[PDB]
Amino acid sequence: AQDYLKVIWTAQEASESIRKLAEQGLVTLTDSGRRAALAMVRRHRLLETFLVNELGYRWDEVHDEAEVLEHAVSDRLMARIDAKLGFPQRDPHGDPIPGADGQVPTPPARQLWACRDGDTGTVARISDADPQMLRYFASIGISLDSRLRVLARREFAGMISVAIDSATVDLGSPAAQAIWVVSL
Amino acid sequence: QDYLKVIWTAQSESIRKLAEQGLVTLTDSGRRAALAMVRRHRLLETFLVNELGYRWDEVHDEAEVLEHAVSDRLMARIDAKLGFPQRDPHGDPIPGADGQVPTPPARQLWACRDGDTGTVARISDADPQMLRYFASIGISLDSRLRVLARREFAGMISVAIDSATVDLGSPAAQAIWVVSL
């Protein structure tokens, strides 16, 4: 039932259990659903950061693991992970790690598809909904904090070329439309 | 399924269900499946203590639950973190990935006789209160001991530490294993 909270919430970022969340005064996300979904997101993202940074994972596999440990990790263990991790703020993908209060440090970023020619920015967020995408960005050089310079906006070709802190590369419309970037 | 561990440490109808899986009084695949869970609930304890700053006596109730959610890749990478842990924070030997299991000719403390000396190497984590007792009186792994007075009745034994002299009861002394050198 709690698997849809990190969905209904992450939408702005099967009815069986939907009528079961509202059975807890939880759901139309009310005031409690925000902190519930934000807590579960905190656990998931923190697990991603821990597996990647400490246990030497790659940012594409790290998801399918944390989707089960979230239902077997205590709050003590989670707080000591958050302590060892340096109290982080973001995924290895750039997904913001909220605080225990509802901080959710969202960065002022728009999608690489929303940019135009001559614009520059820093890769602050990469979508994780598909590991092949993260494998591709690992293949090129699109990591976090990478600085991109948009060269060509060919909407007719459904592409957009960018320059990377290294070389140029051509990214498709759905490719460069996951990856979020902060301007200038 | 947790019985796989307790039947391995010493070596109802809950054990027959492992003969159903072809595991048990341990078979080759049975003692090879106990090696798994035993590596889990051991690498997990030494990871909690050594990396995430735990303090024993409360790593049991955690690893006993994480053991049912750790993948072989996760366990192998934890082992690669520690690199390459041969023994529990309580003293239980980490079974080698091949299945060697280090060799500790270790006797009980109560089973020792008067005058015997030896390095302690394994402590039971069944009772965390007992672990806090062992921490406060000053006994931990690798501290040489000397059986001074094994009193068969009523359940007492006086031992000399290298830190002292402790009068340990039988329920306590039945939780210390010791090698002799």
| Angstrom distance (rounded) from CA A89 to CA B134 | 40
The count of residues in chain A is 184
Residue A140 contacts residue A148 (beta carbons within 8 Å): no
CA atoms within 13 A on the CB side of A79: 5
Residue B163 half-sphere exposure toward CB, CA atoms < 13 A: 17
A115 backbone φψ class: left, alpha, beta (φ>0; ψ -120 to 50)? beta
CB contact under 8 A, B69 and A65: no
Question: How far apart are alpha carbons A180 and B18 in whole angstroms?
Answer: 52
Report the C-alpha gap between A125 and A103 in whole angstroms.
17
The amino acid occupying position A94 is G
Q: Are the beta carbons of A181 and A123 closer than 8 angstroms?
A: yes
Q: Which residue has the tokens 């602050």?
A: A124
Among B52, B66, B78, the residue with its CB nearest the CB of A72 is B66
Q: What is the DSSP string of B7-33?
A: HHHH--TTTHHHHHTT-----HHHHHH
DSSP, collapsed to helix, strand or coil, labels residue B176 as strand
Would you call B148 helix, strand, or coil by DSSP? strand
Under a CB-based contact definition with an 8 Å cutoff, are residues A53 and A127 in contact?
A: no
Torsion of CA B21, B22, B28, B30, to 10 degrees: 30
Which of A65, A71, A81 has the CB atom closest to B71's CB atom? A65
Q: What is the full DSSP assignment across B32-73?
A: HHHHHHHHHHHHHHHHHHHTS---SSSSHHHHHHHTTT--HH
Cis peptide before B154 (omega within 30 of 0): yes
Amino acid identity, residue B159? V
CA distance A100 to A22: 23
Is the CB of B66 inside 8 Å of chain A's CB atoms?
A: yes
Q: B169 near B133, Cβ under 8 Å?
A: no
Which residues in chain B touch residue A72, judged by CB atoms under 8 angstroms apart? 65-66, 68-69
Q: Measured in Å, how far apart are chain A's first and last C-alpha atoms?
A: 41
Task: Tell whether A50 lies on the interface with B, counting CB pairs under 8 A.
Answer: no
Q: What is the SS3 string spanning chain A?
A: CHHHHHHHCHHHCCHHHHHHHHHHCCCCCCHHHHHHHHHHHHHHHHHHHHHHHCCCCCCCCHHHHHHHHCCCCCHHHHHHHHHHCCCCCECCCCCECCCCCCCCCCCCCEECCCCCCCCEEEEEECCCCCHHHHHHHHHCCCCCCCEEEEEEEECCCCEEEEEECCCEEEEECCHHHCCEEEEC
CB atoms near residue B57 (< 10 Å): 19
CATH number of the structural domain A1-102: 1.10.10.10
The class that CATH gives domain B107-178 is mainly beta
For residue A4, what are the contacts with CB-CB under 8 A and spacing of at least 6?
A14, A17, A18, A21
Q: How many CB atoms lie within 10 A of CB A67?
A: 11
Quick check: B89 and B21 in contact, CB under 8 A?
no
Task: Give me the torsion for CA of B126, B131, B137, B138, rounded to 10°.
Answer: 120
> How many CB pairs lie under 8 A apart between chains A and B?
37
Look at residues B46, B45, B24, B48 and name the one whose alpha carbon lies nearest to residue B34. Answer: B24
Chain A partners within 8 Å of B62 (Cβ)? 74, 76-77
Peptide bond into B84 cis (omega under 30): yes
Cα separation of B92 and B5, whole Å? 12
Instruction: Report domain extents, chain A.
Output: 1-102, 103-184
Q: Residue A97 in contact with residue A90, Cβ under 8 Å?
A: yes
Helix pair angle (A75-84, A31-53), 10° resolution: 50
- Angle of helix B72-82 relative to helix B28-50, nearest 10 degrees? 50
Q: Dihedral of the CA atoms B96, B99, B105, B108 (nearest 10)?
A: 90
Backbone angles phi, psi at A40, to 5 degrees: -60, -40
Q: Cα(A29)–Cα(A17) distance, rounded to whole angstroms?
A: 14
Residue A66 and residue A52: Cα distance in Å, rounded?
11
Name residue A139's amino acid: S
Report which of A85, A62, A78 is spatially closest to residue B77, judged by C-alpha positions: A62
Measured between alpha carbons, how far apart are the two ends of chain B, in Å? 37
- For B114, the 3-state DSSP assignment is coil
Interface of A with B in 75-94 (CB under 8 A): 76-77, 80-81, 83-84
Residue B52 to residue A76, Cβ atoms within 8 A:
no
Q: Which amino acid is at B173?
A: A
Give the CA distances from residue B133 to residues B49, B57, B91, B106, B118, in Å, rounded to whole numbers and listed in that order: 18, 10, 16, 22, 20
Q: Quick one: tokens of B80? A: 């690669």
User: What CA–CA distance (Å, rounded) separates B104 from B121?
Assistant: 8
Chain A partners of B53 at a C-beta cutoff of 8 Å? 80, 83-84
